[PDB]
Amino acid sequence: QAVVTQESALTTSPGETVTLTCRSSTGAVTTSNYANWVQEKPDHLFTGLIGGTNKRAPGVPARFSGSLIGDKAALTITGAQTEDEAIYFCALWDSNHLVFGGGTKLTVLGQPKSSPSVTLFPPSSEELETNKATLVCTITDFYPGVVTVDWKVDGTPVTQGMETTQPSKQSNNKYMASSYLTLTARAWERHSSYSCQVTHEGHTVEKSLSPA
Amino acid sequence: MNKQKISPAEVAKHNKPDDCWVVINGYVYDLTRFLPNHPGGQDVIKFNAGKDVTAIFEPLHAPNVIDKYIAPEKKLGPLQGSMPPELVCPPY
Amino acid sequence: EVQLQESGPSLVKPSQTLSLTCSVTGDSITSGYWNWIRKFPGNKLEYMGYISYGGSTYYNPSLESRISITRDTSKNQYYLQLNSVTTEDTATYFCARLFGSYYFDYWGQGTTLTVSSAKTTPPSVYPLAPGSMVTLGCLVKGYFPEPVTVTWNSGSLSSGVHTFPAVLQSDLYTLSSSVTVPSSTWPSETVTCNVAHPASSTKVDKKIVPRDCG
Ligand code: HEM
């Protein structure tokens, strides 16, 4: 069963042309794959854009085109607009099965980039009375809305016990997220250093802490 | 299966109730023994036998019906170039 | 101008059989391919399968044993049935049409479906305190079902307040909220965190105090 692969994320600014591409794992995409493209905006909003490789759905702005670029299907946005900021899903008909990829997050710069505003809260002393502990790392005001978050206890990356939320859109069109670090009260006491590390646009912003 | 190019000349020739070929996308199909069993009725195929039916076929069928009904032996091979204008079906 | 509306439960326990409806107004379902799509919590879309305008079906080869798509032209609707439900089935379900072979025209709004054995549980609320501007937080941890309604100083303080999407820790929900105030304004003046969970019908409010030790 072919696996359909597409760009993590792509940033671009109004007016520019942007191309998003779509690769199948087993071979090169031809028109028999009937490549398909749909857009997802916040609030469960889905819009069909392209079908049969290069066929615009009705009601779709002409700035949207599909084509066969090298060995993959391609979605071309010629003269991108701020409202084109959303997640793009590719779908291919492979082996009589229709398959979505993991989608692309396309940022269409509507305001200057901004770096994240990270804040680490320790476990509250009341939560420790349950033999549980939860550090909370709040990430605000970042743009574009892509962010990888990491944790270190005593200078070592933490494998298990963490969950981060999906970047969500703020009222001012930047993005926010939270990361939780769950431990038992025993673990919390048995270690000394704690860190939440937010990588955005190249650099990493780190907020660090010790109990005292 | 890696199969031989077929020319438009040869396809156009296959266009009667009991010798029916069609071009969907750029590929060739012998729909002859399929006729009796076309849920869309025989006529539509007959009427268009020996033609490129891409523009009619594709919006009425999902891409995975061909392999449910049609034996692969009847997937004849890929078209050489393209069917002459007169023999390409357009949307109605 | 052409609407798809999904129907069904919002919650169903694992083991059970989920039943979803798609009501279609503005066009006859005897024309395109009519389908089901899922959107998991992690942003992954999954094509469920379809039924034709003639009643022909097709299902994702991972769902053949479970999924079952029916239709009734008279009421002009089709359906999705998915038994042996599991935690993994937690997602938002969409119906969309497919101009057979070409593009998706018409998607529904979707319905969220949650699979859980969890019994109704009030949140435990804990102040999140650090120790020019001071950033205070609130941890609403370990509740079911959603939602919670979170506020600061009874709504008095509504600038620079970020309430984040709840995640799922040990079959229960956890979410946290934060407000940002001047350093001059706290400890000095009281910042209380308000949490209403309509389901368990509780309502608590945590004052945020300077830190401990240790
Ligand atoms: C290539 C092999 C073909 C196969 C396997 C096939 C199979 C089918 C099937 C199963 C249906 C019913 C669709 C459903 O119930 O969802 C259908 C419908 C239809 N087909 Fe085909 N077909 C083929 C070729 C063609 C060709 C060449 C034409 C004419 C160009 C054609 C014209 C139609 C039409 C007009 C309908 C719809 C009739 C209606 O609305 O009731 N088909 N076909």
How many Å apart are CA B49 and CA B45, to the nearest integer?
A: 6
Statement to judge: residues C13 and C101 lie in one domain: yes
Instruction: Tell me how far apart the terminal alpha carbons of chain B are, to the nearest angstrom.
Output: 34
Q: What angle do CA A91, C50, C115 make, to 5 degrees?
A: 90
Q: Which of A51, A164, A166 sits opposite C99 (nearest CB)?
A: A51
CATH number, domain at C4? 2.60.40.10
CB A135 within 8 A of CB A127: no
Expressed in Å, this structure's resolution amounts to 2.7
How is residue C150 written in tokens? 């979170």
Q: β-strand B51-52 against B27-30: which pairing, if any? A: unpaired
How many Å apart are CA C89 and CA A60, to the nearest integer?
A: 32
Quote the distance between the C-alpha of residue B9 and its chain's center. Answer: 14
Q: A55 in contact with B at a CB cutoff of 8 Å? A: no
In angstroms, what separates the C-alpha of B65 from chain A's closest C-alpha? Answer: 8
In angstroms, what separates the C-alpha of B18 from chain C's closest C-alpha? Answer: 27
User: Is A96 in contact with B25 (Cβ distance < 8 A)?
Assistant: no
Statement to judge: residues A16 and A104 lie in one domain: yes
Domain count, chain A: 2
Strand order in the sheet with A156-157: A156-157, A148-153, A194-200, A203-209
Cβ contacts of residue A198 below 8 Å, gap of 6+? A116, A118, A137, A139, A142, A147, A148, A149, A204, A205, A206
Domain endpoint, select from A110, A137, A172: A110
How is residue A142 written in tokens? 């970042």
Helix or strand or coil: residue A46?
Answer: strand
How many Å apart are CA A123 and CA A98, to the nearest integer?
A: 46
Tell the residue number behind the tokens 């393209």, with chain if given. B82
Statement to judge: residues A1 and A95 lie in one domain: yes
Statement to judge: residues A17 and A122 lie in one domain: no
* Interface residues from chain B to C (CB-CB < 8 Å): 39, 58-65
Domain endpoint, select from C117, C147, C171: C117
Statement to judge: residues A147 and A85 lie in one domain: no
Report the separation in Å between the CA atom of B62 and the middle of ligand 1, taken as the mean of its atom positions: 10
The half-sphere exposure of A35 on its side-chain side, counting CA atoms within 13 A, is: 31
How is residue C88 written in tokens? 């993994």
Domain endpoint, select from A110, A142, A157: A110
Statement to judge: residues C112 and C18 lie in one domain: yes
Domain count, chain B: 1
Residue from B22, B32, B44 to probe ligand 1 pocket by mutation (most atoms less than 8 Å from CB):
B44
Q: A156 in contact with B at a CB cutoff of 8 Å? A: no
Ligand 1 pocket check for B65: Cβ under 6 Å: yes
Ramachandran category for residue C62: left, alpha or beta (phi over 0 → left; psi -120 to 50 → alpha): alpha
For residues C59, C63, C67, C70, the Cα torsion angle rounded to the nearest 10 degrees is 0
Statement to judge: residues C78 and C66 lie in one domain: yes
Question: Closest residue of C to A172, CA-based?
Answer: C160
In angstroms, what separates the C-alpha of C208 from chain B's closest C-alpha? Answer: 59
Question: Closest residue of B to C60, CA-based?
Answer: B64
Structural domain for A129, as ranges:
111-210
Q: Can you state the percent helix, strand and coil of chain A, rounding each to 5?
A: 5, 55, 40
CB A87 within 8 A of CB A103: yes
Helix or strand or coil: residue A128?
Answer: helix
For residues C108, C165, A183, C121, the Cα torsion angle rounded to the nearest 10 degrees is -80
CB A116 within 8 A of CB A170: no
How is residue A141 written in tokens? 């005001």
Statement to judge: residues A91 and A140 lie in one domain: no
CATH number, domain at A86? 2.60.40.10
Statement to judge: residues C140 and C77 lie in one domain: no
Statement to judge: residues C17 and C103 lie in one domain: yes
How many Å apart are CA A29 and CA A22, to the nearest integer?
A: 8
Specify the amino acid at residue C197: H
User: SS3 for A5-28, per residue?
Assistant: ECCCEEEECCCCEEEEEEEECCCC
Structural domain for C7, as ranges:
1-117
In angstroms, what separates the C-alpha of C184 from chain A's closest C-alpha? Answer: 19
Structural domain for B56, as ranges:
1-92
Statement to judge: residues A89 and A184 lie in one domain: no
Residue A59's CB is within 10 A of a number of other CB atoms, namely 10
Q: Which of A31, A52, A93 sits opposite B64 (nearest CB)?
A: A93
Residue-wise DSSP of B7-74: -HHHHHT-EETTEEEEEETTEEEE-TTTGGG-TT-SHHHHHHTTEE-HHHHHHHS-TTSHHHHS-GGG
Statement to judge: residues A157 and A197 lie in one domain: yes
Tell the residue number behind the tokens 């998607």, with chain if given. C107
Q: Which of C54, C58, C99 sits opposite B64 (nearest CB)?
A: C58
Statement to judge: residues A55 and A69 lie in one domain: yes
Domain endpoint, select from A65, A83, A110: A110
Burial C75-90 (b: 16+ CB within 10 A, else e): ebbbbbebeebeeebb
Mutate to test the interface with C, among B27, B65, B66 (most CBs of C within 10 A): B65
Report the separation in Å between the CA atom of A95 and the middle of ligand 1, taken as the mean of its atom positions: 20
Burial C143-181 (b: 16+ CB within 10 A, else e): bbbeebebbbbeeebeeebbbbebbbbeebbbbbbbbbb
User: Please, which residues bridge with residue C139 across strands?
Assistant: C126, C176
User: Is C33 in contact with B62 (Cβ distance < 8 A)?
Assistant: yes
How many Å apart are CA C16 and CA C114, to the nearest integer?
A: 12
Q: β-strand C202-207 against C192-197: which pairing, if any? A: antiparallel
User: Please, which residues bridge with residue A199 across strands?
Assistant: A148, A204
Statement to judge: residues C14 and C98 lie in one domain: yes
Q: Which of C119, C44, B53, B46 lies closest to A91, judged by CA?
A: C44
Residue-wise DSSP of C74-117: TTTEEEEEE-S--GGG-EEEEEEEE-TTS----B---EEEEE--
Q: Could you tell me the sign of the dihedral formed by the alpha carbons of C160, C124, A139, C39, in that order?
A: negative
Q: β-strand A9-12 against C91-98: which pairing, if any? A: unpaired
Domain count, chain C: 2
Statement to judge: residues C123 and C113 lie in one domain: no
How many Å apart are CA A171 and CA C193, to the nearest integer?
A: 21
How many Å apart are CA C4 and CA C32, to the nearest integer?
A: 13
**C55: in domain:** yes
Strand order in the sheet with C91-98: C11-12, C111-115, C91-98, C33-39, C45-51, C57-59
Q: Which of C111, C97, C103 lies closest to C28, judged by CA?
A: C97
Statement to judge: residues A83 and A186 lie in one domain: no
CATH number, domain at B4? 3.10.120.10
Statement to judge: residues A59 and A137 lie in one domain: no
Looking at the CA of residue B70, tell me the nearest atom of ligand 1: 5
Question: Closest residue of A to B54, CA-based?
Answer: A52
Residue-wise DSSP of A145-188: S--EEEEEETTEE--SSEEEPPPEE-TTS-EEEEEEEEEEHHHH
Q: Please give the helix or strand (H or E) that residue C143 lies within, else none.
A: strand C133-143
CB C208 within 8 A of CB C136: yes
* B27 is known to lie in a ligand binding site: no
User: Please, which residues bridge with residue C197 across strands?
Assistant: C202
User: Please, which residues bridge with residue A136 across strands?
Assistant: A121, A180
